[PDB]
Amino acid sequence: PSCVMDDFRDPQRWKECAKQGKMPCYFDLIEENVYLTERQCECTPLSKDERAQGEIACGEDCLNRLLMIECSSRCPNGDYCSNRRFQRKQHADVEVILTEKKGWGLRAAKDLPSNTFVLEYCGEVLDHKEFKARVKEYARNKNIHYYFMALKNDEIIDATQKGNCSRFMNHSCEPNCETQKWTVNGQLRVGFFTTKLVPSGSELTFDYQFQRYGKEAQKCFCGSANCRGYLGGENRVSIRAAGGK
């Protein structure tokens, strides 16, 4: 079974597709990070001719791109700025698929060039108090999958209840994606980017570098020759540590 991202826009149909096991369980689809408690480049503007020639606005040499900052609407290249991927939701062509043992996952629907933006990891941003509260709730409920992503010291992203299809990217000890933290509007966001050419049909993975606070570690089924056997690796850390101190 597989589904495209558009399938998640229709809740009623998503829900009944889920009853027949045709789509993953329902969660709240959001366009950007939601906080539980709240807290310009020097590119030379492309001519119309360069635009027509296929020149890239704010490409490799953009001072903002280089520091992993997105441009605003006030960018010198304006509409044509190619450095506003997070804000324009310019995700890769990706599908959500049911895997053998890891639950649902992500898969390339087209070839994906190296260093291609895939999706933003959206969710509810928690502080330490909120994180601890949800650690308990998720344990009480006996959740299997976990969706905590460290953003900064007092900010963890939690896509358990709210997020987008990025919450489906499985771990691999030998992955074809990575996280990159991007500054968007003075706020930090995390997004997945490919680390290499990913052929169409290939599953999309990143290395969790998982900080396990659980008593028992989950077994990893990535199937790599360098697989570490478990998510979190050898060590178990405290709750506060996983949570960023």
Partner: peptide, 15 residues
């Protein structure tokens, strides 16, 4: 207490 659980940690890929 928690039987399972953990936090994913962003890092740049390095071979």
């Amino acid at each position: 207490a928690p039987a399972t659980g953990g936090v994913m940690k962003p890092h740049r890929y390095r071979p």
